[PDB]
C-alpha cells in the first residue's frame, strides 16, 4: 500500500522541508505532513495496477495484414509476411518506448478472420515463424512450409484463437527500445533501433490449396509482454509516429495551449 498520512500540528522552527534546491537533480520528498496541518489517514491504496507487469500485461495488436487464398501459383498476395517488430502500431510502441531497455516474454495471440465479396465451410491457416537466416517461402506452396525446425502453428476457424509463448530471444541482455548508433563500425549504414531488431519473420498462409471464390483472410497479431524487466525510463512519445523504422518526427507542441497564463476555465461565470 501507499504511504499513510501522518498527523502534523503547528510548526515554528528552522526546519524547512518546503525549501529545497531542484538544481541538485533531486526531487523533494515533501508530503502534506510537512507543509500543512494533516490528520492521520490510514491509506490502503496500492500501486498494483501501475507495475510494469500490469501496465504492459495487456495484449495489444502489433500487426494486421491480409492474404488471399486464390491467385496465380507464384502470387505473393496469397501469404503474409511480417518481419516481427513492435513499431507498427503506435499504442504498444509508445508503451514500450517509455523504457530504454526491456526484457520480457511475449504471449502472442492471433485473430484470423475472413473477408468475402459477391462455399468453403472453414479454412485452416499456417503461421510459420522463420528465425533470422532461415529459408523464406518463395510461393504459398513452397517447400519451406513443411517446417521441420521452424515453429509453426495451424489453426482452423471457429476454434479458439491461436496462442503461443515466446521467450526472451535477443542476443543482448535486453531488448533495446532505442539504439543511438549505427549498424557499421564506420558510423554509417542503418541508424537506430533497426540495427538491433533481429527477430525473425512471420509467414501466414491458407493451408487450403484453393477455393471456388476468392477469400481474403486477415490476421491480427496481439503481443502481450510478460515477465517484464524494464530499465532507464524515458519521456513518453510526444510527436506522432511517421515511420516504423526510425524516431523521425514532426515538431509537436509541448501541450495544448491556453489564451493567457491565468486562463483558468471556471464554472461559476
Amino acid at each position: 500500500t501507499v504511504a499513510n498520512t501522518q498527523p502534523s500540528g503547528p510548526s515554528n522552527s528552522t526546519e524547512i522541508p518546503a525549501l529545497t534546491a531542484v538544481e541538485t537533480g533531486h526531487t523533494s520528498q515533501v508530503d502534506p505532513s510537512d507543509t500543512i496541518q494533516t490528520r492521520h489517514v490510514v491509506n490502503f491504496h496500492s500501486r498494483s495496477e501501475s507495475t510494469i507487469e500490469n501496465f504492459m500485461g495487456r495484449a495489444a495488436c502489433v500487426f494486421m495484414d491480409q492474404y488471399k487464398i486464390n491467385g496465380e501459383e507464384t502470387s505473393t498476395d496469397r501469404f503474409a509476411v511480417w518481419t516481427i517488430n513492435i513499431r507498427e502500431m503506435a499504442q504498444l510502441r509508445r508503451k514500450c518506448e517509455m523504457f530504454t531497455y526491456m526484457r520480457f516474454d511475449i504471449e502472442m495471440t492471433m485473430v484470423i478472420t475472413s473477408c468475402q465479396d459477391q462455399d468453403m465451410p472453414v479454412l485452416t491457416h499456417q503461421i510459420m515463424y522463420v528465425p533470422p537466416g532461415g529459408p523464406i517461402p518463395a510461393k504459398v506452396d513452397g517447400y519451406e512450409w513443411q517446417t521441420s525446425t521452424n515453429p509453426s502453428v495451424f489453426w482452423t476457424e471457429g476454434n479458439a484463437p491461436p496462442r503461443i509463448s515466446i521467450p526472451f530471444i535477443s542476443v543482448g541482455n535486453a531488448y533495446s527500445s532505442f539504439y543511438d548508433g549505427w549498424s557499421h563500425f564506420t558510423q554509417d549504414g542503418t541508424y537506430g533501433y533497426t540495427t538491433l531488431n533481429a527477430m525473425g519473420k512471420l509467414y501466414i498462409r491458407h493451408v487450403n490449396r484453393s477455393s471456388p471464390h476468392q477469400i481474403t483472410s486477415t490476421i491480427r497479431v496481439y503481443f502481450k509482454p510478460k515477465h517484464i524487466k524494464a530499465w532507464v525510463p524515458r519521456p513518453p512519445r510526444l510527436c506522432p509516429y511517421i515511420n516504423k523504422r526510425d524516431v523521425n518526427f514532426v515538431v509537436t507542441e509541448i501541450t495544448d495551449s491556453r489564451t493567457s497564463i491565468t486562463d483558468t476555465p471556471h464554472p461559476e461565470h
Binding site: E23, S170, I254
Partner: protein
Amino acid sequence: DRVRSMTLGNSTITTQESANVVVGYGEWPSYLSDREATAEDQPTQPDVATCRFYTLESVQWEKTSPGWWWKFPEALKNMGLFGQNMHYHYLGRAGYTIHVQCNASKFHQGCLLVVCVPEAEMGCADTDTTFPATELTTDTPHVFTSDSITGKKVQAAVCNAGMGVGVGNLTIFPHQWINLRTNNSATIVIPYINSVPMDNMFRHYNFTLMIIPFAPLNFTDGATAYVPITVTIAPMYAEYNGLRLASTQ
C-alpha cells in the same frame, strides 16, 4: 557542501558553488564482473592514463542560444589515450563523471538543464530520409534550434529535444541544473548503461549530454557578455577487449 573537489587521474576539478553530485540511477561505475562478462580475452584497464578529466571545447552561452548536445563516448575519440584505446580495441566499457562548468556574476541569470540521456536516438529533420553521422557527432558540439529546421540533419527544434518528446520531461534521466544564482557547475556520475556487457565505442553512442537553457541567459549592459559553458568529462573504470589494428576514424 557547496564546495567539491574531484580527482581522477593527474587531473583535479575544484568547484566552490556547486549543487550535489548526481550518481546516475544511484549507481557508481564499476568494472565488469566475471559473472556478467562475455568477451573471454583479458581486458586492458589503463586506469590513470584514460580515466582522467578531459575538457571539451567550450561553447558560448547567449541570450538566445537554445542548447547543445554531445554524443559520448564518441566525442572522446582522439582525446588522449582514451581515444587511442577506443581506436585500437573492438569493445570498450566505462562510466563517466560529466562536470559541466558555467560561472557568471550575481547580476546574471539563467538556468540550464544538464542531462545525460541514455540512447538519445534522434530523428531526422526530413522525416523520410536519414542523416549522416556528422550531423550527430561533434570538435564543436551540435546545437539545438529554437524553431523546426529542415534537411538531412537532426530535427533540433529544442521543444522536442531531437527525440520527439517533451523537453521538460528530460528530468527522468540523470540530470542537474546550473542556476546562475545557485551554482556554477553540474556533476553527473553516470555508470555504464547498455543492454550488453561491452560495446563498440564508435558506432554506438551510449549517452548524449544535453545542455538546454530553460531560463534564457539575461544581464544588463556592463555585465560580462561572454559567458562560456565548458564540459569536462572523465571516463571511469574504463576497460577494453578485442585489441586489433587501430580504426581510422
